[PDB]
Design an enzyme around this catalytic site. Structure first.
Site, PDB file in Angstrom:
ATOM      1  N   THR A 159      -7.833  15.370  -1.139  1.00  0.00           N
ATOM      2  CA  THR A 159      -8.154  16.164   0.041  1.00  0.00           C
ATOM      3  C   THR A 159      -8.823  15.350   1.176  1.00  0.00           C
ATOM      4  O   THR A 159      -8.255  15.253   2.281  1.00  0.00           O
ATOM      5  CB  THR A 159      -8.839  17.500  -0.373  1.00  0.00           C
ATOM      6  OG1 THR A 159      -7.886  18.311  -1.122  1.00  0.00           O
ATOM      7  CG2 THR A 159      -9.185  18.286   0.807  1.00  0.00           C
ATOM      8  N   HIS A 265      -4.763  24.864  -8.346  1.00  0.00           N
ATOM      9  CA  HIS A 265      -5.576  24.240  -9.373  1.00  0.00           C
ATOM     10  C   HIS A 265      -5.691  25.159 -10.610  1.00  0.00           C
ATOM     11  O   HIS A 265      -5.622  24.655 -11.740  1.00  0.00           O
ATOM     12  CB  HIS A 265      -6.955  23.895  -8.847  1.00  0.00           C
ATOM     13  CG  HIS A 265      -7.002  22.599  -8.118  1.00  0.00           C
ATOM     14  ND1 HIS A 265      -6.860  21.386  -8.757  1.00  0.00           N
ATOM     15  CD2 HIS A 265      -7.188  22.321  -6.805  1.00  0.00           C
ATOM     16  CE1 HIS A 265      -6.947  20.413  -7.868  1.00  0.00           C
ATOM     17  NE2 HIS A 265      -7.166  20.952  -6.683  1.00  0.00           N
ATOM     18  N   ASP A 308      -1.944  18.471   3.340  1.00  0.00           N
ATOM     19  CA  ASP A 308      -2.551  17.196   3.031  1.00  0.00           C
ATOM     20  C   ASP A 308      -1.864  16.460   1.827  1.00  0.00           C
ATOM     21  O   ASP A 308      -1.833  15.225   1.786  1.00  0.00           O
ATOM     22  CB  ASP A 308      -4.065  17.348   2.874  1.00  0.00           C
ATOM     23  CG  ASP A 308      -4.462  18.412   1.811  1.00  0.00           C
ATOM     24  OD1 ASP A 308      -3.573  19.080   1.198  1.00  0.00           O
ATOM     25  OD2 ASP A 308      -5.686  18.547   1.600  1.00  0.00           O
ATOM     26  N   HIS A 309      -1.313  17.221   0.885  1.00  0.00           N
ATOM     27  CA  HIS A 309      -0.691  16.722  -0.402  1.00  0.00           C
ATOM     28  C   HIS A 309      -0.121  17.929  -1.122  1.00  0.00           C
ATOM     29  O   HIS A 309      -0.429  19.063  -0.773  1.00  0.00           O
ATOM     30  CB  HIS A 309      -1.702  16.012  -1.326  1.00  0.00           C
ATOM     31  CG  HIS A 309      -2.924  16.826  -1.571  1.00  0.00           C
ATOM     32  ND1 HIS A 309      -2.911  17.960  -2.362  1.00  0.00           N
ATOM     33  CD2 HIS A 309      -4.174  16.738  -1.055  1.00  0.00           C
ATOM     34  CE1 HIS A 309      -4.102  18.531  -2.323  1.00  0.00           C
ATOM     35  NE2 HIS A 309      -4.890  17.801  -1.554  1.00  0.00           N
ATOM     36  N   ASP A 683      -1.436 -13.184   0.596  1.00  0.00           N
ATOM     37  CA  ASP A 683      -2.485 -12.237   0.880  1.00  0.00           C
ATOM     38  C   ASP A 683      -3.667 -12.373  -0.129  1.00  0.00           C
ATOM     39  O   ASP A 683      -4.008 -11.420  -0.808  1.00  0.00           O
ATOM     40  CB  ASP A 683      -1.940 -10.801   0.937  1.00  0.00           C
ATOM     41  CG  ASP A 683      -2.935  -9.819   1.593  1.00  0.00           C
ATOM     42  OD1 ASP A 683      -3.845 -10.279   2.327  1.00  0.00           O
ATOM     43  OD2 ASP A 683      -2.806  -8.584   1.373  1.00  0.00           O
ATOM     44  N   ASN A 685      -6.870 -12.319   0.370  1.00  0.00           N
ATOM     45  CA  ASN A 685      -8.005 -11.441   0.615  1.00  0.00           C
ATOM     46  C   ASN A 685      -7.598  -9.950   0.629  1.00  0.00           C
ATOM     47  O   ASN A 685      -8.385  -9.067   1.044  1.00  0.00           O
ATOM     48  CB  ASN A 685      -8.746 -11.879   1.880  1.00  0.00           C
ATOM     49  CG  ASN A 685      -7.920 -11.691   3.131  1.00  0.00           C
ATOM     50  OD1 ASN A 685      -6.712 -11.445   3.062  1.00  0.00           O
ATOM     51  ND2 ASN A 685      -8.550 -11.850   4.288  1.00  0.00           N
ATOM     52  N   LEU A 689      -2.675  -8.221   5.362  1.00  0.00           N
ATOM     53  CA  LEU A 689      -2.324  -8.996   6.538  1.00  0.00           C
ATOM     54  C   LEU A 689      -2.086 -10.461   6.209  1.00  0.00           C
ATOM     55  O   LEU A 689      -2.756 -11.031   5.340  1.00  0.00           O
ATOM     56  CB  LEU A 689      -3.426  -8.891   7.592  1.00  0.00           C
ATOM     57  CG  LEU A 689      -3.943  -7.523   8.091  1.00  0.00           C
ATOM     58  CD1 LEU A 689      -5.112  -7.814   9.027  1.00  0.00           C
ATOM     59  CD2 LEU A 689      -2.861  -6.761   8.840  1.00  0.00           C
ATOM     60  N   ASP A 691      -2.286 -14.171   5.601  1.00  0.00           N
ATOM     61  CA  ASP A 691      -3.373 -15.163   5.554  1.00  0.00           C
ATOM     62  C   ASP A 691      -3.130 -16.368   6.480  1.00  0.00           C
ATOM     63  O   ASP A 691      -1.991 -16.855   6.624  1.00  0.00           O
ATOM     64  CB  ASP A 691      -3.506 -15.733   4.135  1.00  0.00           C
ATOM     65  CG  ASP A 691      -4.003 -14.717   3.113  1.00  0.00           C
ATOM     66  OD1 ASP A 691      -4.402 -13.574   3.486  1.00  0.00           O
ATOM     67  OD2 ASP A 691      -3.915 -15.053   1.907  1.00  0.00           O
TER      68      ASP A 691
END
Ligand SMILES: *[C@@H]1O[C@H](CO)[C@@H](O[C@@H]2O[C@H](CO)[C@@H](O[C@@H]3O[C@H](CO[C@H]4O[C@H](CO)[C@@H](O)[C@H](O[C@H]5O[C@H](CO)[C@@H](O)[C@H](O)[C@@H]5O[C@H]5O[C@H](CO)[C@@H](O)[C@H](O)[C@@H]5O)[C@@H]4O)[C@@H](O)[C@H](O[C@H]4O[C@H](CO)[C@@H](O)[C@H](O)[C@@H]4O[C@H]4O[C@H](CO)[C@@H](O)[C@H](O)[C@@H]4O)[C@@H]3O)[C@H](O)[C@H]2NC(C)=O)[C@H](O)[C@H]1NC(C)=O
Ligand SMILES: O=C(c1cc(OCC2CCOCC2)nc(C2CC2)c1)N1CC[C@@H]2CN(C(=O)c3ccc4[nH]nnc4c3)C[C@@H]2CC1
Ligand SMILES: [Ca+2]
Ligand SMILES: [K+]
Ligand code: NA
Ligand SMILES: [Zn+2]
Length: 805
Positions: A159, A265, A308-309, A683, A685, A689, A691
């Site tokens: 959520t 739920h 949301d899902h 990548d 780290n 993005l 390196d």
């Protein structure tokens, strides 16, 4: 402290928040225990219910009623939403034929079409079809407006992470809300659903829509409703705000529904008790639309209906317990449920070892319903690693299952039959999108897309400039009638060199050998032109990728493939080749098994060497253009160039060999030719993005050959598969992957079996968008096609998911 002594008179659902200890009358005051004494009496009226009846028509204004049926109600903007229907012979919005909204049809004084975002928790995508008979208002929005068959949530499919992604356009790792529950070690604080810490602003990163709007002078209706305020009152409040004078009236509004999640739920996603909450959500939609129609706003407002899902079937008996795997189970903290996150209970315990925890959780039971990962080994498409709040050890839980620490946790906490939070590719987790209004298209279906894209579109709908985010702005232009965003392609930063023959064989001292001293003017002008780029239009279908950062690199041409070779990383950044339906797989001849050949176009100093690989007992090598797909015996020698070589662990070579020997041909066969671009990714780290060289943590021993963390491939063909990939007249079709470059196959529990039983499944798991690969490499693909840029942007965001219908 709250001095609850002041009054809410004339302040009911006030738009600016007032500072403690002065009492509050905004829609969030209950949640802070900060309402004035008279809030309920003045603001939360209920008398006579929510609908006009025949005999309330033309009544005398009684201010005590929840909503009015008096004559003045219209100009006061506080009629019951069904007033004109009951009292003025009008029809319900849902009973009117749909009619294209070509332009905003707004009252005088409206500067832009307003936006109303109607968000529904736990609204699984398939409810649109399966509940269609009980949701006639929702089905009218869907069929008359613009809709996707589903929308992909972000991971984890919880959520708070998803609502905040909708608000910001950001991955949870960047916005900071990485679960419904979190520990931040820098703050030494905990975030929970229940409680006060979640209200502190330091949790919430990025810039959400309401702040983007405020900063740019667009007024936002307070987005959030205290849970006790009933739905009918929220709608009436929105409608009342829409009656404010021009200078005070917001341009953007939010309604949130706890349903159908709340019931999902308890009863599971398709429980017979689920019909009622679906009916009730639809009725609320009907009240909004009837309310807008009364105000003549129903052809003026843009309405987004968004989940949301979704929701999956999950019961208490489908729980794995870490106490069935771990001896030291009391030395760990587990964030439990539909995902798992593990850290040490105490940072003073120096005998806590994540390595041994992972090994103890790996492939231990024949049908094990979770898989452990170091976070940096999670599929890159989840973008779930670069945050201090995401524990190093993660468990990806199978759909339909839970993970808990010890059995006591499950019975001292079957209550629930539904849950969510699983891998965002899972069908049951998909959710909905419907756009309706003057700015959306009429009766249009659009392909599925990811919820990270919507912030840009909501910004476009309001004429805002979006804060920097993870959407690809322009990739959803095909949803919109106008207000499109016209991006330009990024500028190429580094141009390539085009080296010719510049070095003699004997200048190379690489410890490489090749049985190639094997000997004509016909086939010699031929090899010259292939090296000049004579077949480049065959293997480079969409232009060369643009390099978007400063670097030194060379374009290398060959008969069968083209590469952009990095002098800095000593390997290609990319290798491009086309495999037609007709192409033939061949094997590597025996004399060529260990053949590596110097490339006379590239200096020894910018070359890999064979000796490093001999010395490196862990590391082997593979090739980017596969020698198996060489067009001829003579062309095959090009595939053994030292410039086509990349470092590979023996365990990963199993993966790579199968992809190159079996799968490429299979796809060419199924898709009528494929274009393939492959390359390394670094990548270290795990920020998703590219390196820079100073970030590389591993080299082939004794050399400056950097070791990739991942290998990618982008496999393009014609969407109309009756045309071959190299002669495609219209839209393209793509699938891609980012395979982790791992020294073991521990991730695949059946890896001691034939590659035919596990490799393709691994690749499917590590499916990727081209856009993911762009972030990771600093390259920009599809630079030269006949297609519109917006369409290319859409293609670059496509994710091939490998879930059934
Ligand atoms: C998805 O989209 C987003 C948004 O576009 C992308 O994230 C951006 O990526 C940028 C590049 O990594 C990053 O830029 C850095 O920003 C630093 C200043 O940033 C602050 O200001 C912005 C603007 O208001 C703000 O949004 C940031 O908010 C982050 O931090 C707070 C916590 O303090 C959180 O509440 C918030 O959620 C967010 O956290 C996320 O980002 C950070 C990184 O910024 C992560 O660490 C977190 O895990 C979390 O994911 C900030 O408050 C700036 O200082 C950086 O500059 C350094 O590097 C450059 C290289 O150009 C160099 O010029 C400088 O020297 C400097 O180095 C110095 O700092 C180093 C680190 O301490 C040090 O080692 C050096 O030696 C130097 O001292 C840098 O420019 C930008 O902040 C984020 N934005 C967001 C919102 O996350 C994301 O990349 C996209 N993802 C993909 C896959 O595409
Ligand atoms: O008002 C909201 C709200 C709506 C919202 O909108 C964002 C819009 C952006 C534009 O695009 C559209 C969206 N953003 C947020 C937070 C992220 C900033 C919260 N909520 C009320 C109920 C509380 C109680 N909850 C629970 O008690 C709860 C609910 C469902 C659950 N499932 N599993 N656990 C759960 C716990 C969930 C919690 C959050 C939802
Ligand atoms: Ca990186
Ligand atoms: K080796
Ligand atoms: Na294995
Ligand atoms: Zn839920």
């Amino acid at each position: 402290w709250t001095a609850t002594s002041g009054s809410c008179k004339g302040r009911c659902f006030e738009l600016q928040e007032v500072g403690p200890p002065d009492c509050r009358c905004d829609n969030l005051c209950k949640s802070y225990s900060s309402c004035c004494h008279d809030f309920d009496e003045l603001c939360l009226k209920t008398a006579r219910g929510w609908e006009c009846t025949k005999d309330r028509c033309g009544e005398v204004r009684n201010e005590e009623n929840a909503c009015h049926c008096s004559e003045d109600c219209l100009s006061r903007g506080d009629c019951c939403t069904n007033y004109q229907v009951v009292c003025k012979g009008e029809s319900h919005w849902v009973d009117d034929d749909c009619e294209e909204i070509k332009v905003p049809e707004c009252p005088a004084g409206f500067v832009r079409p307003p936006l109303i975002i109607f968000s529904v928790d736990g609204f699984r995508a398939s409810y649109m079809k399966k509940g269609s008979k009980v949701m006639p208002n929702i089905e009218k929005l869907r069929s008359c407006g613009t809709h996707a068959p589903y929308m992909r949530p972000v991971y984890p499919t919880k959520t708070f992470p998803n609502l905040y992604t909708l608000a910001t356009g950001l991955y949870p790792e960047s916005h900071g809300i990485v679960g419904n529950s979190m520990y931040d070690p820098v703050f030494d604080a905990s975030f929970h659903l229940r409680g006060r810490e979640k209200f502190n602003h330091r949790w919430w990163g990025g810039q959400p829509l309401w702040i983007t709007a405020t900063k740019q002078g667009v007024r936002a209706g307070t987005f959030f409703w205290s849970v006790s305020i009933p739905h009918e009152r929220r709608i009436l409040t929105i409608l009342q705000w829409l009656s404010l004078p021009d200078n005070e009236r917001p341009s953007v509004y939010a309604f949130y529904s706890e349903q159908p999640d709340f019931s999902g739920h308890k009863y599971g996603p398709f429980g017979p008790e689920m019909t009622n909450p679906l009916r009730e959500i639809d009725k609320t939609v009907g009240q909004l639309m009837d309310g807008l129609k009364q105000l003549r706003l129903h052809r003026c407002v843009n309405v987004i209906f968004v989940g949301d899902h979704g929701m999956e079937d999950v019961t208490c008996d489908r729980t794995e317990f870490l106490s069935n795997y771990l001896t030291n189970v009391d030395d760990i903290t587990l964030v439990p449920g539909t995902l798992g996150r593990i850290r040490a209970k105490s940072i003073n315990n120096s005998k806590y070892d994540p390595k041994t925890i992972i090994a103890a959780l790996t492939c231990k039971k024949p049908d094990q319903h979770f898989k452990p990962y170091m976070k940096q080994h999670l599929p890159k498409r989840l973008h779930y690693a670069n945050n201090r709040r995401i524990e190093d050890i993660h468990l990806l839980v199978d759909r339909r299952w839970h993970v808990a620490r010890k059995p006591l946790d499950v019975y001292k906490k079957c209550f629930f039959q539904g849950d969510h939070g699983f891998d965002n590719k899972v069908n049951s987790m998909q959710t909905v999108f419907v756009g309706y209004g003057p700015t959306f298209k009429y009766r249009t279906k659009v392909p599925p897309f990811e919820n990270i894209e919507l912030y840009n579109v909501m910004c476009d709908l309001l004429g805002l400039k979006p804060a920097p985010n993870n959407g690809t702005h322009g990739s959803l232009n095909h949803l919109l009638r106008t207000n499109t965003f016209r991006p330009t392609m990024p500028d190429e930063v580094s141009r390539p060199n085009y080296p010719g023959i510049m070095y003699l064989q004997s200048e190379f001292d690489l410890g490489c050998t090749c049985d190639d001293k094997v000997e004509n003017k016909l086939e010699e002008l031929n090899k010259r032109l292939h090296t000049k780029g004579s077949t480049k239009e065959r293997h480079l279908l969409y232009g060369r990728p643009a390099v978007l950062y400063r670097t030194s690199y060379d374009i290398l041409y060959h008969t069968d493939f083209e590469s952009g070779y990095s002098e800095i990383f000593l390997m290609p950044l990319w290798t491009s080749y086309t495999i037609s339906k007709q192409a033939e797989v061949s094997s590597i001849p025996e004399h060529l098994t260990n053949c590596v050949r110097p490339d006379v176009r590239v200096s020894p100093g910018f070359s890999q060497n064979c000796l490093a690989y001999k010395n490196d007992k862990q590391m082997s090598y593979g090739f980017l253009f596969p020698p198996y797909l060489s067009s001829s015996p003579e062309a095959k020698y090009d595939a053994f160039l030292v410039t086509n070589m990349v470092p590979m662990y023996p365990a990963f070579k199993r993966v790579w060999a199968y992809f190159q020997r079996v799968l490429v041909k299979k796809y060419a066969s199924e898709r009528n030719g494929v274009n393939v671009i492959s390359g390394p990714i670094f990548d270290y780290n795990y920020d998703g993005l590219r390196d820079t060289e100073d970030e590389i943590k591993q080299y082939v021993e004794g050399s400056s050959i950097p070791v990739p963390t991942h290998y990618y491939s982008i496999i393009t063909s014609c969407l109309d598969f009756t045309q071959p990939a190299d002669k495609c007249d219209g839209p393209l079709s793509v699938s891609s992957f980012i395979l982790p470059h791992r020294p073991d196959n521990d991730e695949s529990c059946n890896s001691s079996e034939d590659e035919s039983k596990w490799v393709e499944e691994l690749m499917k798991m590590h499916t990727a968008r081209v856009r993911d690969i762009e972030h990771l490499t600093g390259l920009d693909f599809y630079r030269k096609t006949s297609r519109s840029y917006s369409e290319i942007l859409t293609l670059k965001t496509y994710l091939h998911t490998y879930e059934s219908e």
